[PDB]
Amino acid sequence: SLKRRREKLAKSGEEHGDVTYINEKNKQFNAKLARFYNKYTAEIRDSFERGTMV
Amino acid sequence: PSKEEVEATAERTKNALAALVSGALAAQKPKNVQVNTKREATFVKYTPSAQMGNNTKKQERIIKIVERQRDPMEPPKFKHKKIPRGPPSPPPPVMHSPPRKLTAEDQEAWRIPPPVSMWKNPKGFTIPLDKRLAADGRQLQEVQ
Amino acid sequence: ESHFDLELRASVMADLMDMMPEGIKQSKVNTVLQHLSEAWRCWKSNIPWKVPGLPAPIENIILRYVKAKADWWISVAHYNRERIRRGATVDKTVAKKNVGRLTRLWLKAEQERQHNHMKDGPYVSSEEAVAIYTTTVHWLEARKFSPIPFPSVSYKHDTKILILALERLREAYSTKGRLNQSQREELALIEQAYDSPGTTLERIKRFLLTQRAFKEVGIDMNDNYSTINPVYDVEPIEKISDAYLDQYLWYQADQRHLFPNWVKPSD
Amino acid sequence: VKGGVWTNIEDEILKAAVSKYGLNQWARVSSLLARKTPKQCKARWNEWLDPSIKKIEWSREEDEKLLHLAKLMPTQWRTIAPIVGRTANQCLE
Amino acid sequence: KQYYPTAAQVFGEGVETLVQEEDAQPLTQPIIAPVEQKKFSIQEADLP
Amino acid sequence: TTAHRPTFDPARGKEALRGPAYHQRLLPAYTTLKFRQPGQGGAADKSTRDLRAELEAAEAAHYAKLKGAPRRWDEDVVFKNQARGTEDKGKRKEFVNDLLRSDFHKRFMSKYVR
Amino acid sequence: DVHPNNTQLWIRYIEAELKNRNINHARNLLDRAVTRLPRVSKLWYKYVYVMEMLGDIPGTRQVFDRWMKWEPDEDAWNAYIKLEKRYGEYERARQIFAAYTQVHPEPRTWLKWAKFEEEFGTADMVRDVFQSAIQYIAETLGDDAVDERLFIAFARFETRQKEYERARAIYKFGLDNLPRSRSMQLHAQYTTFEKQFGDKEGVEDVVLTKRRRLYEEQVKENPKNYDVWFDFARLEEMGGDPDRVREVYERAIAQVPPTQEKRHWRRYIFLFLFYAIWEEKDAKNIERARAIYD
Amino acid sequence: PRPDWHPPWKLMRVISGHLGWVRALAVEPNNQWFASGAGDRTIKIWDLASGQLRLTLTGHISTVRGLAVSPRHPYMFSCGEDKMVKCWDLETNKVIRHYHGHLSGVYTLKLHPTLDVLVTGGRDGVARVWDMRTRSNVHVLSGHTGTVADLVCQEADPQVITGSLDSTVRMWDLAAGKTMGVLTHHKKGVRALVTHPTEFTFATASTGSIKQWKCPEGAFMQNFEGHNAIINTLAVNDQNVLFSGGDNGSMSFWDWKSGYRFQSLDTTAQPGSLDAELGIMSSTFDMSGARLITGEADKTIKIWKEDTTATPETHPIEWKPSLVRRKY
């Protein structure tokens, strides 16, 4: 259990892509938000990527 | 239960509750001067047990107990204290029926979305804007 | 209000614990109380509340209790307005709270009215509209009315009209101790219009020729204790244009006899 | 003075401020963007930076809808714009 | 505008619908009437 | 800032402290119970079937009482008869379980917001 | 005292004692916990696991016996059977199946007992388990609620025993005494059985019945599938039951196409052509063929 | 045990007029009027035969959750979520006593059948036994860890039975103020309790589960199976009809002796209601058992009566002596 705790702390400390957070609890909450809501926000995310369209 | 058992119960409980009502009344209205005129004595027969260290028998004892004359001008003697309430009585066995067999689809159907408020941010989080606009239905809203 | 919130939260939580199937992991239920708060704020702002992926029984619990809170809130609004109108209260916090509640209620009703007009069409029938228009053209042709022109570049009364307009806006500022940002910038725009009347006139006429989409208008309520009435907060640059147009149209209608004798108040 | 052109610094700070503060706290947002008013920050989000705003070129169906509605409800651009699907300033321009 | 059907449509034909928004009786009229004696003459209890 | 917080564990009721009587809390009031008198009912049971019978008797009496069981100045103008079908409102009062769409609330807003 | 019924808390306390080697403290906690929460199988599993780690196999049996008194689910009965099989007491595991079928009388548990006896018993006791399962489910749930899974497994056990006549008798009896909607898979297994061991005439008999039922289901879904009607027609002709073929063609004729399109009337008139060819070349009914043409 | 036959029930009358959820109901002991208590802070008195509004009483500042009309006194007792328990003199239509001391909202109020005693239960986890005359709080029945959602008072021991949202039922010795027994059989919060009028048994309702118990020892009798809802209310006849009323608006009518459900239906919401507002929140029979009164979250009172034209051959009992293993 302690080993899994170390491994998940390391993989959470790794950062792939854009920083959307300002601390660690925020990072965890944003990851939880991505896990839940990304199946509903894909068009809005595409709009924020490219810059336009609904 | 029959009428006689109901009336026996009503008498027993009316007596116990009446004693508590008198206690509550005398607490709610202290009786101005807390002395009693009817200060008669109780007698107690007192057969003793042996001793600390002696097992020789010794004499039977008549005790005259009177309630002490207290000064009517005195306030109560002791400041009250806050003590945490004690633990409950030992909890009973939990007598449930066999557990419901759930599926992973039941677990998924009762998972709850993380709330993103449009007004509140107590921890000062920075929320991505798609997550901030997810719960808005004004993107859904259609005008004809 | 603090006590109502305590009771409401305990009721919603007891319903959710009893609704949850045995064996679901049940740490995050305070999460649902956060959804309840957000739904209440959405109701107050007349914003549709729709959480994607929220389980339907939980949504039903929240909708049920948001409506119950709304019922209590509206009943207190009614009771306090009756007390304010009667004069039965002098509590200044109660009055400003009640005016806030009635502002929110009025704007909910007003959004519903606007939506109903888009859905149920123009309420004036086309026959009624044509009859109204025809009555107007027959009247104005009988009175020989000359239509008001667009103000010329060299209209000989522009300076007087503009000075009247700017004096009206400045006297709207006359008795003011503390000024906010929009108030200070409207004073600055008025003094710039005083210093350069010709440039302001060209800008005003350019706006009147060209602009057809405008800024947002703030709305508040003025309380008279018997009624309340809407007060509109218009962008200052637009207010200068509107006041010029107001003075111009009134002067031209007076010179062209648009209003007959029965129209009151009269100057 | 409080106004002027919107630059990339201002737009990106506005988006990060919206990500901290939401869309109902424009005075906090403007307090970060202290060259613009709260009304200007809100107008910038509503007319440009909202992700539902289409900034691609107009299609022929969109043009036909725009002209048809401008004939029906004349000079009523705040009414026309949700039916067309673009902003009021986009429809007018 | 009517947004909702009538109570007769919602509840059907054999259901009586009552909208009671006013009291029949005042607050001064007691729910349980007290027993009053209404003595208007000072008559003796027994024979003196 | 978790100083301002909800209640998850509301206060549990406690047995009273026990001690000598000095503090005066609750002044005596209404120290006699009223009992139901002759004619005030309450201590008057008939029977289940009896009570049923008076129930449908009274209810049938109410239903039976409800049912009844023992050139011109006004031709110059442009719009005509525009208020027919308006005064005929008032057949049945409908309770609506939506407060913001009730006639009470509509009346309220018409009276107070002007 | 604050969380009397919390499984995670009970486990933490028990594990603190076990980690620090306070075995008697921990066993007192385990008795207290399974007294407090007798329908939480986690605490029961922890207690049986701890006693088996400590090597008290009688103690493990004691904990399991108390659990069985609480009448747990099938996983706990299975775990206790597997304990006795681990330590070699097949008669004790037999006793646990007796109690197990009394508490959980489903076909699943009866078939587990039958597989157990096939591995660790005699063929007579496998047969006794199967007969007892059929009889028990009959006397409780009714004679049409006995499961084709029981019948299939009994027949397959006899096939493993090379009792082909007994297997055929079991298959035939189950098909005769069950509804077809709940003897589907019994018939499929019977078909594979006859393809494996039966004679040729039995093979086309059972294939005829299987395909007849399949085409009947297809007609019940789509009454107007003409190629399905043609294939079931040829199936009945190759079967050679004349009244059945006549009834099949009569139902096919009664399936009249409501559309007046000649593109459907091709196949419908063509179906009349095959009714004529059958009652000219096989039934040799000339008057019936004339009636067909009329 | 074969069920007795009972006719189905049907909706007879809908009464509108409360501006909140109808949460409390009490029938006066001579069957002429009933009181309703609602989330609009109010207590209404209705004539039972005509369903007609006689009077509105105000005097709570939150939802009225409990109502009792005394059979021995001209009193009605009201308890509410503003922590307040009030005695109303019905000869003056006025509050005359308070029973103050619940730390939070008071959910349930019952009168003792033979003693001049009130029992209330609330969100502070306790039942409070009050002396009616002196307003004295003679017992704090303590031991629950959740809200005391419902409560019954009997004339023989156990004289108080409380059911609580900690999922637990307690039978209480009222003379000593102590728990005789704890019933832990329900998995969810116990919201409803009812005692039988002629036999010495009671029923408890949590979510999806109705249990019947024999007094005085609290022995388990039977489960009323199949009402899969949060049950807010139970009501029982003297003709052995048990009604269970469910928070989603679902209603069941059971034969009390056998546990057989002879009727299932849903209530209907008053026009304007959300579909989330379908729900039975309070219920009682009238004093005769011929009328069921329900208070509902669509803010209505509904009166239900038995179908007079129904017959044991028109509505046959669809019960077979079942033969499976109920895995208890």
Side-chain angles (χ1 to χ4, degrees):
Chain A
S1 54
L2 287 169
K3 186 189 172 176
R4 284 137 37 201
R5 169 72 171 177
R6 261 180 311 251
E7 293 165 323
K8 285 183 180 187
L9 258 58
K11 186 180 289 293
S12 57
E14 285 182 346
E15 166 53 46
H16 288 178
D18 283 322
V19 162
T20 48
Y21 43 87
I22 53 177
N23 48 53
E24 186 36 41
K25 294 219 207 175
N26 189 179
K27 185 169 169 64
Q28 297 294 321
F29 184 75
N30 279 1
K32 171 189 260 191
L33 284 183
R35 276 179 253 126
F36 211 94
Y37 279 106
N38 263 6
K39 64 156 85 70
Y40 309 103
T41 42
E43 185 163 346
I44 290 296
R45 274 187 287 127
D46 289 337
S47 313
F48 273 127
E49 282 153 15
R50 78 171 75 90
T52 178
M53 292 180 183
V54 294
Chain B
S2 54
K3 289 223 158 169
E4 284 84 18
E5 315 171 17
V6 170
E7 293 179 353
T9 290
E11 266 286 338
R12 179 186 46 94
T13 51
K14 200 175 194 263
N15 290 342
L17 290 194
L20 299 168
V21 173
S22 281
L25 268 175
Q28 283 150 40
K29 201 75 176 297
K31 185 262 291 179
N32 206 308
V33 162
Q34 302 297 109
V35 310
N36 289 333
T37 299
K38 300 289 94 176
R39 204 193 66 133
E40 69 275 16
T42 300
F43 288 103
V44 165
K45 183 175 174 66
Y46 200 41
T47 312
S49 291
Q51 191 59 66
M52 283 74 74
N54 290 318
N55 282 74
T56 185
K57 183 266 290 180
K58 49 182 62 179
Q59 46 196 354
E60 212 269 342
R61 270 202 200 255
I62 313 293
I63 314 297
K64 185 169 148 194
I65 308 181
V66 310
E67 188 194 303
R68 172 192 192 81
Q69 299 156 339
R70 70 174 88 230
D71 187 12
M73 296 299 105
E74 290 272 353
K77 306 184 69 166
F78 305 124
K79 184 177 177 182
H80 298 168
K81 290 176 280 196
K82 299 204 291 202
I83 311 301
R85 64 163 83 222
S89 8
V94 176
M95 305 288 301
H96 283 175
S97 84
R100 180 174 159 179
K101 304 195 177 77
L102 300 163
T103 63
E105 293 82 3
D106 295 342
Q107 297 284 346
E108 280 306 313
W110 288 91
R111 270 169 29 101
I112 297 162
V116 192
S117 183
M118 296 184 284
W119 293 262
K120 302 292 146 142
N121 192 15
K123 291 180 183 294
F125 285 169
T126 289
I127 303 299
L129 296 192
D130 64 283
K131 301 309 187 294
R132 270 205 187 280
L133 301 161
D136 267 318
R138 272 157 320 164
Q139 286 83 15
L140 280 299
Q141 281 209 339
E142 178 67 36
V143 294
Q144 287 182 354
Chain C
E1 273 150 333
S2 69
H3 173 81
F4 183 93
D5 177 65
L6 286 167
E7 293 304 318
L8 163 73
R9 280 178 71 96
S11 303
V12 172
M13 188 59 80
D15 277 7
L16 161 74
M17 304 309 299
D18 290 333
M19 185 64 73
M20 272 282 162
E22 174 204 5
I24 312 284
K25 298 167 169 169
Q26 77 201 315
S27 74
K28 315 266 162 199
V29 292
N30 313 130
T31 299
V32 169
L33 286 181
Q34 309 203 287
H35 284 291
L36 165 78
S37 305
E38 175 86 336
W40 171 248
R41 287 183 290 267
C42 287
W43 189 89
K44 270 181 85 150
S45 56
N46 209 38
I47 292 176
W49 179 76
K50 200 53 180 170
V51 174
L54 182 74
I58 281 158
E59 173 154 23
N60 291 324
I61 296 169
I62 282 165
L63 290 170
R64 171 179 287 185
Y65 277 93
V66 160
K67 187 144 168 197
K69 183 179 186 176
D71 286 335
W72 166 74
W73 190 87
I74 293 155
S75 302
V76 159
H78 291 160
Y79 173 84
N80 281 340
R81 185 41 53 175
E82 292 306 327
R83 264 168 68 237
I84 280 163
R85 193 264 308 150
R86 259 191 290 136
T89 188
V90 289
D91 200 336
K92 186 178 54 48
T93 291
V94 169
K96 65 182 181 180
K97 276 164 62 86
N98 190 180
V99 165
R101 293 206 196 189
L102 296 202
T103 314
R104 283 184 175 287
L105 291 173
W106 188 72
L107 284 165
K108 289 169 75 70
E110 184 65 22
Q111 297 186 21
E112 183 177 1
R113 186 179 72 90
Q114 294 300 310
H115 180 258
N116 284 356
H117 191 253
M118 304 303 93
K119 291 302 183 83
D120 311 329
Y123 295 110
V124 192
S125 85
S126 64
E127 296 92 24
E128 277 166 349
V130 164
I132 279 170
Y133 183 90
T134 309
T135 307
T136 312
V137 307
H138 289 346
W139 176 257
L140 291 164
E141 181 164 14
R143 312 307 281 177
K144 305 275 189 296
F145 182 81
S146 190
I148 293 156
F150 189 85
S152 314
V153 185
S154 60
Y155 182 58
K156 54 179 168 187
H157 305 315
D158 276 329
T159 310
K160 283 150 276 178
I161 293 304
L162 180 62
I163 281 163
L164 284 165
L166 300 165
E167 270 314 297
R168 295 288 73 66
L169 307 166
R170 186 267 182 275
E171 62 86 20
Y173 279 124
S174 77
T175 81
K176 270 285 167 55
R178 292 289 276 175
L179 292 177
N180 60 62
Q181 183 262 324
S182 75
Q183 295 181 294
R184 290 183 310 264
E185 66 183 1
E186 182 195 1
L187 271 194
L189 280 173
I190 283 161
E191 66 182 1
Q192 293 179 356
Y194 271 136
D195 302 3
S196 281
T199 313
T200 303
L201 283 165
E202 310 158 347
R203 186 200 69 216
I204 279 164
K205 288 165 187 173
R206 199 164 61 245
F207 278 165
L208 294 168
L209 281 167
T210 58
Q211 292 217 297
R212 301 296 171 252
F214 300 96
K215 313 288 209 197
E216 278 166 317
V217 176
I219 202 164
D220 290 330
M221 291 304 197
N222 189 57
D223 193 8
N224 315 308
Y225 300 149
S226 289
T227 61
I228 68 178
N229 64 7
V231 186
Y232 296 86
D233 205 304
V234 174
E235 205 69 34
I237 200 81
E238 318 197 334
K239 269 209 286 175
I240 286 162
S241 296
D242 299 337
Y244 176 84
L245 185 56
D246 176 47
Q247 301 279 349
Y248 177 78
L249 286 176
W250 273 110
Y251 181 71
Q252 293 285 344
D254 190 79
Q255 295 308 102
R256 292 162 139 92
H257 314 291
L258 175 58
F259 304 111
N261 46 33
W262 64 75
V263 182
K264 297 307 175 184
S266 197
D267 288 346
Chain D
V1 297
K2 311 293 287 303
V5 67
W6 275 95
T7 69
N8 175 264
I9 289 277
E10 280 171 334
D11 266 6
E12 295 307 314
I13 289 175
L14 174 41
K15 275 180 303 191
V18 164
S19 183
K20 190 173 192 105
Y21 288 123
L23 292 177
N24 287 303
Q25 280 179 126
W26 295 112
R28 312 183 100 152
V29 167
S30 177
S31 170
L32 282 72
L33 288 178
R35 207 186 276 189
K36 302 280 182 305
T37 75
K39 202 168 191 261
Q40 278 157 2
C41 292
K42 181 185 183 184
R44 179 60 170 185
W45 175 265
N46 278 327
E47 301 290 313
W48 198 247
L49 299 178
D50 179 65
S52 66
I53 293 167
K54 315 162 78 79
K55 304 162 185 114
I56 55 173
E57 59 162 16
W58 290 61
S59 80
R60 197 168 174 86
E61 293 83 3
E62 268 182 347
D63 280 353
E64 195 158 358
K65 199 156 196 226
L66 161 79
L67 296 162
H68 193 271
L69 284 160
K71 177 195 49 154
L72 265 64
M73 302 175 302
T75 192
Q76 284 144 48
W77 295 108
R78 297 307 169 169
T79 312
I80 278 162
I83 314 156
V84 163
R86 308 266 187 146
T87 75
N89 277 99
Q90 266 177 342
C91 289
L92 184 48
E93 184 178 1
Chain E
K1 189 150 148 57
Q2 296 298 109
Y3 303 86
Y4 308 109
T6 63
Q9 297 169 9
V10 164
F11 292 109
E13 265 291 273
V15 172
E16 180 197 4
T17 300
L18 291 176
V19 184
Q20 300 291 320
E21 286 159 347
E22 287 275 302
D23 292 354
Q25 89 189 47
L27 196 68
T28 46
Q29 197 199 296
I31 292 300
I32 296 172
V35 286
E36 69 275 16
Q37 292 80 17
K38 297 296 265 180
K39 298 187 201 80
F40 302 101
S41 68
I42 47 159
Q43 295 288 287
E44 293 217 8
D46 70 323
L47 277 72
Chain F
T1 313
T2 187
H4 300 96
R5 53 170 51 167
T7 298
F8 301 135
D9 184 25
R12 191 139 312 151
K14 64 179 73 174
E15 68 275 8
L17 196 144
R18 56 174 201 111
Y22 207 64
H23 176 101
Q24 289 183 239
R25 185 174 101 78
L26 183 67
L27 285 181
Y30 295 84
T31 80
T32 302
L33 287 171
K34 283 168 168 195
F35 285 95
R36 270 162 191 275
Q37 297 294 321
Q40 304 197 317
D45 55 351
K46 295 178 176 66
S47 180
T48 294
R49 47 181 204 84
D50 291 331
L51 276 180
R52 274 186 181 247
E54 294 95 11
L55 180 69
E56 298 82 27
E59 183 178 1
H62 151 79
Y63 277 134
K65 182 174 72 68
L66 259 55
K67 184 264 289 181
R71 193 194 88 151
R72 220 169 82 192
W73 77 289
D74 70 293
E75 77 182 0
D76 171 36
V77 308
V78 64
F79 290 113
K80 293 182 183 293
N81 297 292
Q82 290 288 337
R84 295 220 292 258
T86 74
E87 59 99 18
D88 288 324
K89 297 289 194 69
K91 299 304 153 286
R92 74 281 191 191
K93 296 298 293 295
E94 284 289 332
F95 191 87
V96 164
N97 195 30
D98 177 68
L99 189 38
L100 285 198
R101 283 160 176 182
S102 53
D103 77 316
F104 183 73
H105 183 71
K106 280 148 73 180
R107 272 188 271 121
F108 180 90
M109 301 303 289
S110 276
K111 159 175 197 143
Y112 282 114
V113 193
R114 283 196 59 96
Chain G
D1 278 329
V2 176
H3 314 268
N5 318 314
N6 192 283
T7 297
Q8 200 201 343
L9 170 61
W10 275 108
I11 280 161
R12 277 283 166 90
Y13 193 9
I14 287 161
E15 271 176 358
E17 306 277 43
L18 291 162
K19 278 166 185 210
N20 299 108
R21 311 171 65 88
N22 310 312
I23 297 300
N24 270 332
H25 279 104
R27 288 190 275 185
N28 288 343
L29 288 184
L30 282 156
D31 285 332
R32 267 171 75 196
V34 299
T35 301
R36 172 79 43 94
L37 302 154
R39 287 260 153 84
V40 178
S41 72
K42 180 73 191 191
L43 300 162
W44 285 110
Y45 277 129
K46 183 163 202 46
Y47 194 12
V48 294
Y49 174 62
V50 160
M51 311 289 291
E52 207 179 317
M53 293 298 291
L54 294 174
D56 195 350
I57 304 310
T60 303
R61 284 195 189 90
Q62 165 205 75
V63 182
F64 264 123
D65 271 313
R66 300 160 53 205
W67 199 1
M68 296 300 103
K69 271 186 278 291
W70 272 97
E71 283 202 4
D73 306 343
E74 303 157 328
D75 63 358
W77 294 89
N78 296 327
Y80 178 56
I81 294 167
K82 281 177 182 128
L83 174 77
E84 309 276 17
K85 293 205 300 183
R86 255 200 309 285
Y87 289 93
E89 270 87 22
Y90 307 122
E91 173 61 45
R92 282 185 76 74
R94 203 167 286 128
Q95 292 311 112
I96 302 164
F97 290 105
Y100 188 10
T101 58
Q102 289 311 125
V103 177
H104 293 291
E106 290 85 5
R108 193 185 155 271
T109 68
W110 290 103
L111 294 181
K112 284 192 175 191
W113 195 3
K115 171 181 279 212
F116 172 81
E117 300 275 43
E118 192 165 3
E119 191 173 339
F120 298 106
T122 73
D124 297 297
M125 296 181 315
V126 192
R127 287 163 188 145
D128 292 346
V129 168
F130 274 124
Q131 295 269 349
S132 309
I134 303 288
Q135 178 165 3
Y136 192 99
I137 302 173
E139 296 178 312
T140 307
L141 260 55
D143 303 357
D144 60 354
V146 176
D147 213 11
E148 61 167 4
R149 265 178 311 152
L150 282 72
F151 280 115
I152 282 162
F154 193 15
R156 283 185 77 86
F157 159 72
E158 301 276 19
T159 303
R160 270 192 299 278
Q161 291 309 289
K162 293 182 183 292
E163 317 294 329
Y164 301 133
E165 282 78 15
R166 289 176 62 87
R168 198 170 280 122
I170 289 155
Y171 278 130
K172 280 178 178 299
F173 187 82
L175 277 165
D176 291 331
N177 296 114
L178 278 185
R180 71 180 70 85
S181 72
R182 63 181 293 165
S183 74
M184 294 299 291
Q185 285 288 259
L186 186 43
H187 206 292
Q189 291 272 356
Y190 184 38
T191 309
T192 54
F193 165 72
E194 296 272 27
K195 288 194 257 159
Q196 276 165 78
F197 299 106
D199 53 352
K200 186 211 183 66
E201 46 263 23
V203 172
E204 292 84 4
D205 170 359
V206 69
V207 171
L208 165 60
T209 316
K210 182 171 176 65
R211 301 295 301 176
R212 158 183 314 155
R213 186 209 307 240
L214 182 54
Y215 287 141
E216 185 71 31
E217 296 164 15
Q218 281 169 348
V219 175
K220 186 75 174 177
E221 291 181 353
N222 295 303
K224 64 183 181 293
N225 216 0
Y226 279 104
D227 59 356
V228 159
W229 270 112
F230 292 165
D231 272 320
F232 181 74
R234 289 294 298 168
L235 174 62
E236 294 293 330
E237 301 202 11
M238 294 299 291
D241 207 52
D243 62 358
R244 259 189 189 143
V245 175
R246 287 164 187 149
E247 188 200 323
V248 164
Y249 290 161
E250 273 180 357
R251 283 155 47 195
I253 285 166
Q255 282 303 317
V256 180
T259 60
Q260 269 197 339
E261 196 165 57
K262 80 175 298 293
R263 206 185 296 119
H264 315 124
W265 272 92
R266 302 277 263 274
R267 281 188 164 134
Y268 191 63
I269 284 156
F270 183 76
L271 181 60
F272 289 102
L273 289 182
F274 289 172
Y275 182 27
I277 193 66
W278 186 74
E279 278 179 349
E280 188 182 4
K281 215 204 292 186
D282 296 277
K284 307 165 184 172
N285 292 145
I286 309 301
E287 302 183 353
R288 289 224 165 184
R290 290 182 178 122
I292 286 157
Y293 287 131
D294 291 326
Chain H
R2 187 143 206 288
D4 303 306
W5 184 82
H6 306 282
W9 294 72
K10 64 90 176 179
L11 175 65
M12 196 209 86
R13 166 189 288 140
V14 184
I15 301 165
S16 295
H18 293 285
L19 289 191
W21 299 349
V22 187
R23 306 289 306 242
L25 289 168
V27 175
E28 66 92 18
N30 297 98
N31 216 33
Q32 310 297 301
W33 53 265
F34 69 94
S36 67
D40 60 5
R41 296 176 66 251
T42 64
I43 302 168
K44 290 180 187 278
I45 308 304
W46 314 87
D47 173 79
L48 174 55
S50 54
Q52 188 274 330
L53 177 59
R54 309 178 46 169
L55 188 64
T56 311
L57 295 174
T58 301
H60 274 278
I61 62 151
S62 279
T63 303
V64 182
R65 305 283 305 245
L67 285 176
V69 188
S70 171
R72 294 182 296 282
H73 321 87
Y75 294 155
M76 162 183 81
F77 295 85
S78 65
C79 84
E81 287 185 345
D82 57 339
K83 312 165 193 205
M84 308 280 296
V85 178
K86 284 154 187 234
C87 174
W88 301 77
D89 192 356
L90 289 166
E91 282 170 349
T92 66
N93 305 333
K94 289 172 187 314
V95 176
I96 53 158
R97 290 183 192 92
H98 299 334
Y99 305 83
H100 185 88
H102 281 267
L103 303 181
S104 54
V106 192
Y107 272 17
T108 183
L109 184 153
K110 290 281 181 311
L111 292 176
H112 201 279
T114 62
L115 288 184
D116 292 333
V117 166
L118 188 154
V119 185
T120 46
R123 279 220 293 117
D124 57 346
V126 294
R128 290 178 192 273
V129 186
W130 312 91
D131 181 69
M132 176 173 327
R133 183 177 71 80
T134 50
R135 309 155 295 169
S136 293
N137 190 179
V138 303
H139 278 310
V140 185
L141 305 183
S142 295
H144 282 300
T145 55
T147 287
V148 173
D150 208 358
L151 183 157
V152 294
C153 292
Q154 279 173 130
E155 88 285 0
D157 290 299
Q159 295 169 69
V160 178
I161 309 175
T162 51
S164 159
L165 300 191
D166 70 354
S167 73
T168 288
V169 170
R170 280 170 178 257
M171 320 154 282
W172 304 86
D173 177 15
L174 173 57
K178 299 294 187 291
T179 186
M180 302 154 63
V182 191
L183 315 179
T184 60
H185 292 234
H186 291 268
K187 296 166 168 186
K188 285 309 172 37
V190 182
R191 302 183 167 213
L193 280 76
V194 74
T195 64
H196 205 262
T198 178
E199 72 206 62
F200 191 52
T201 50
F202 60 105
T204 52
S206 84
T207 304
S209 51
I210 308 147
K211 307 185 164 290
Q212 194 180 70
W213 313 86
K214 178 192 183 279
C215 289
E217 85 258 17
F220 173 67
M221 294 294 289
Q222 68 182 340
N223 277 324
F224 297 78
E225 310 265 351
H227 196 162
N228 291 323
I230 298 171
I231 296 89
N232 291 336
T233 45
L234 295 179
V236 72
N237 263 346
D238 58 353
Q239 293 180 356
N240 301 271
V241 174
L242 170 80
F243 164 74
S244 63
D247 195 82
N248 61 338
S250 51
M251 325 162 64
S252 286
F253 285 96
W254 322 77
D255 175 64
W256 172 270
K257 181 266 290 180
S258 65
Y260 165 69
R261 181 151 80 157
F262 65 90
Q263 195 180 6
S264 279
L265 72 165
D266 297 317
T267 188
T268 316
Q270 180 178 225
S273 315
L274 296 186
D275 278 302
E277 295 185 296
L278 203 68
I280 296 92
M281 308 307 289
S282 47
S283 80
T284 48
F285 287 100
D286 76 313
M287 288 292 132
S288 72
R291 292 307 175 265
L292 185 66
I293 311 177
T294 58
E296 279 104 350
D298 75 333
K299 310 171 169 105
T300 61
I301 297 149
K302 286 181 172 86
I303 312 293
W304 304 78
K305 82 168 153 176
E306 290 177 350
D307 193 55
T308 47
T309 80
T311 300
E313 293 83 4
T314 305
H315 296 261
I317 285 179
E318 294 294 328
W319 174 90
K320 94 254 110 272
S322 85
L323 241 174
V324 226
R325 247 297 222 88
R326 208 283 192 189
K327 266 99 158 262
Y328 283 108

